[PDB]
Design a protein around this ligand. Structure first.
Ligand SMILES: CC(=O)CCCCC/C=C/C(=O)O
Ligand SMILES: CC(=O)CCCCC/C=C/C(=O)O
Ligand SMILES: CC(=O)CCCCC/C=C/C(=O)O
Ligand SMILES: [Cl-]
Ligand SMILES: [Cl-]
Ligand SMILES: [Cl-]
Ligand SMILES: [Cl-]
Ligand SMILES: [Mg+2]
Lengths: 116, 118
């Protein structure tokens, strides 16, 4: 009757993305506080994490329906407005695209910061 | 503008709180769900539904998106998850929440040693 091993999917996904990009816990902790920097070790992590959740494709194009689907009904119109300002993504590579997206979302809704 | 510190919201934590409130789920029940101990009662099963739907793993008609789910699962479970979803999807049951109950039970029967929390 052994209880199942319980896998924390978010933790697994972060762990995999960090290992793939040489990302430190300190860097993840920065992003989770809303502190953004254009450094591939952390911005490629952000890209990786979004891609794992099907929020972006392999050119860091946002799937708006999936991204909006993260949020409660009450936040939809606010979120749609942010996406109107911040999409489509742009930047020099997938990591920079997500840096620029994160910065746009931060600046567009400066009093809140949502993290997976 | 200058940077100002935002109020930070953890989606998983906020989803659990919202889902608990919207389905009458007790904290003891949340703990049970986290450990994989289920019952076919909506305060458990609609809560589980609610958590899946918040990451687009299910839509509002009990259709599970297998491709979205596979991206979330760790490398070490990919092969097993493919097989388990092959067996257990698409969903079936008497209503939206009961479909998710049956899916959970199918997963537990197929892979007794594997459970997850979002
Ligand atoms: C974790 C994540 O990327 C979700 C991004 C959506 C944020 C847009 C919402 C802004 C607001 O509600 O003010
Ligand atoms: C859409 C957007 O806000 C840019 C990406 C933000 C990174 C999300 C952080 C997730 C986590 O903390 O797990
Ligand atoms: C198809 C598959 O591998 C998992 C589906 C069952 C998960 C039940 C819900 C769990 C949760 O909400 O934490
Ligand atoms: Cl885009
Ligand atoms: Cl309910
Ligand atoms: Cl299905
Ligand atoms: Cl039905
Ligand atoms: Mg939705």
């Amino acid at each position: 009757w052994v209880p199942p091993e319980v896998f924390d999917l978010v933790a697994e996904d972060k762990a995999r993305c960090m290992s793939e990009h040489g990302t430190t816990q300190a860097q993840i902790d920065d992003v989770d506080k809303g502190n953004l920097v254009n450094e591939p070790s952390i911005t490629c992590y952000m890209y990786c994490l979004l891609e794992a959740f099907s929020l972006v494709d392999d050119e860091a194009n946002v799937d708006e329906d999936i991204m909006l689907g993260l949020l409660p009904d009450q936040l939809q119109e606010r979120a749609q407005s942010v996406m109107g300002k911040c999409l489509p993504t742009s930047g020099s590579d997938n990591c920079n695209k997500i840096y620029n997206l994160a910065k746009c979302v931060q600046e567009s809704a400066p009093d809140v910061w949502f993290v997976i």
